[PDB]
């Protein structure tokens, strides 16, 4: 060992590796060592950052001091090495490109929706002759080229004969080329704008470091020729939200205050966007640690506003629809690329929203093709396809929010709920929480809804209650801080859980107002909601107070039918 770059050259001379990684931290330390000894620095870090395509062909010959056994790549310095000794590597958006950054090394952050297959692209074309023996090599740079049928050797110039040349697919140097489409991040896009894409052209050993359905930080030159990829004041803001008292009810009534009441439905929406605990048995079996909430209701009460507020507060929230391009908007279809002669896959709405809230407006207006793909990600976490062109398994961990209406628009008290709801038993049997948001006309309670809508239409401010509505950043930080908690259930809550489950199963196992039966998935959802309630209290254990709240929640979710 010792001089690590010479040891890496010994390792490439031992023929064990083919990738060369150069960091700017060693450059900064060598610059510090040269500057502290009174020698001239002659800065490299301000010269590597501009025109790296000339530097990757110029420093390669200095390492060398057609026969390239290795592949040269770069990586930038972090912010920790940027604050030390007092930029070049900032997280850039695709809206923050400005046009004039064509040729700077940039680190872009974003999701990846479109990827292509690995294909061999030639760099130099080798031609062989039988008349002279001097094999020639031409260099291509563009997407296309022309065959050099005329001989340009050093022996055919001084000759009458100009004999035929042939090509060699073995002596020609190829490269594992792959194109990818990076997309703009959801909370980094401005107000009203859409997340536009950008193209990244990778080559060599980085060709298998990009699997779709993830967030990546790509560092490369901008012609995008990637060089290195990677993947994934605040305490005062969380402690002042905690210290006010009644954290759960304050965080419940803080989100979406432009509507009237319904603290229970939106309280379960709070437990829905906090997610829960993903459980792994470590023996090849993974169960869901997610909730899926149905909102079945009659028109008159607002439904798109709660859905829009949940997608606006939570990150990566994607608004969907029932009809239109939904059939291709829920699965990966195929299309012809307008920049090259290849077929690519277009991703649906379940692939750009990987870890988050996936919402469906007008659930009964869809078809069987949408339902068969929604039920598959509702049960487990992977998308399976069997059509011609792609046969992969796509990872997806999404929380399904659904908004639906009955068969005749509103409800019917003379009809059973199994006949009022057109969805089959396997769909709502998987649904742990279904909210029958039914409107009933009254004399006293309707005046408060009328007073609230006239107060929010008079001015943008909320009613004068002794509570202030919390901004999106603070509870977004609270949800991100509560998500790392892993609560463990006790034995005293275990004996209450099994007795309530036995009594609920016996009570469930067949009349006019009945609907469904008790399933073990509902017991698992009750366990997940208790874990979410313990995660919202930031506790390491699950107490008796969460199960009695969750059972009250799931029973009052269906108790509105008697009104």
């Amino acid at each position: 060992k010792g001089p690590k770059y010479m040891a890496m050259l010994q390792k490439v001379a031992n023929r064990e590796l083919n990738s060369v990684i150069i960091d700017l931290d060693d450059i900064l330390q060598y610059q510090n060592e040269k500057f502290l000894q009174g020698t001239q620095a002659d800065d490299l870090v301000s010269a590597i950052q501009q025109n790296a395509n000339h530097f990757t062909e110029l420093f390669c010959r200095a390492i060398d001091n057609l026969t390239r056994r290795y592949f040269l790549y770069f990586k930038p310095l972090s912010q920790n090495c940027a604050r030390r000794y007092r930029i070049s590597s900032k997280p850039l958006s695709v809206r923050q490109i400005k046009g004039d950054f064509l040729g700077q090394l940039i680190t872009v952050r974003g999701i990846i929706t479109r990827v292509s297959d690995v294909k061999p692209a030639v760099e130099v074309i080798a031609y062989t002759c039988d008349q002279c023996g001097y094999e020639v090599f031409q260099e291509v740079n563009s997407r296309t080229f022309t065959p050099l049928s005329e001989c340009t050797s050093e022996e055919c110039s001084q000759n009458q004969t100009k004999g035929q040349l042939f090509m060699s697919t073995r002596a020609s140097k190829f490269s594992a080329f792959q194109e990818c489409k990076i997309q703009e991040l959801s909370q980094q896009v401005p107000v009203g704008h859409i997340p536009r894409s950008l193209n990244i052209h990778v080559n060599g050993t980085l060709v298998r470091s990009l699997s779709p359905g993830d967030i990546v930080d790509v560092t490369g030159i901008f012609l995008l020729e990637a060089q290195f990829v990677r993947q994934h004041d605040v305490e005062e803001r969380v402690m002042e939200l905690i210290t006010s008292g009644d954290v759960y009810n304050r965080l419940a009534k803080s989100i979406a205050p432009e509507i009237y009441g319904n603290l229970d439905v939106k309280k379960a929406l709070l437990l829905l966007l906090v997610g829960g605990v993903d459980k792994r048995v470590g023996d090849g079996m993974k169960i869901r640690g997610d909730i899926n909430v149905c909102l079945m209701g009659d028109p008159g009460v607002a439904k798109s506003q709660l859905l829009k507020a949940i997608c606006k507060i939570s990150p990566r929230g994607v608004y969907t629809t029932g009809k239109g391009s939904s059939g291709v908007g829920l699965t990966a279809a195929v299309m012809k690329d307008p920049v090259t002669d290849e077929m690519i896959l277009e991703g649906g709405a379940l692939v750009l929203a990987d870890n988050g809230i996936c919402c469906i407006d007008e659930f009964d207006k869809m078809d069987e093709s949408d339902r068969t793909a929604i039920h598959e990600v509702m049960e487990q976490q992977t998308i399976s396809i069997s059509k011609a062109g792609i046969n992969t398994t796509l990872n997806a961990r999404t929380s399904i929010l659904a908004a639906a209406n009955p068969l005749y628009g509103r409800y019917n008290p003379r009809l059973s709920p199994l006949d009022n709801i057109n969805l089959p038993a396997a769909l709502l049997s998987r649904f742990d929480i279904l909210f029958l948001m039914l409107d009933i006309p009254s004399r006293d309670d309707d005046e408060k809804l009328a007073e609230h809508v006239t107060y929010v239409h008079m001015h943008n401010k909320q009613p004068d209650l002794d509570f202030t509505p919390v901004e999106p950043s603070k509870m977004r930080e609270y949800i991100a801080y509560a998500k790392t908690k892993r609560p463990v259930m006790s034995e005293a809550v275990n004996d209450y859980v099994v007795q309530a489950y036995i009594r609920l199963r016996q009570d469930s196992k067949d009349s006019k107002f009945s609907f469904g039966q008790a399933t073990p998935r509902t017991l698992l959802g009750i366990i997940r909601l208790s874990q979410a309630l313990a995660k919202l209290r930031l506790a390491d254990m699950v107490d008796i107070d969460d199960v009695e709240e969750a059972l009250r929640l799931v029973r009052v979710s269906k108790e509105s039918l008697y009104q």
Binding site: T128, G133, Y134, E135, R170, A171
Partner: protein
Amino acid sequence: LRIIWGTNVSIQECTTNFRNFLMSFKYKFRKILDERDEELYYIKQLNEMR
């Protein structure tokens, strides 16, 4: 010494060693490839197939 461009294969030397292996080979892989009667293993097959 004839050398093809980009190839480390000489014609006459490989021709002579291929002929030397073909005129003389009697189950040497049974003796030195592992720790696990006949004569002229390649002459009999080539004289049979013609």
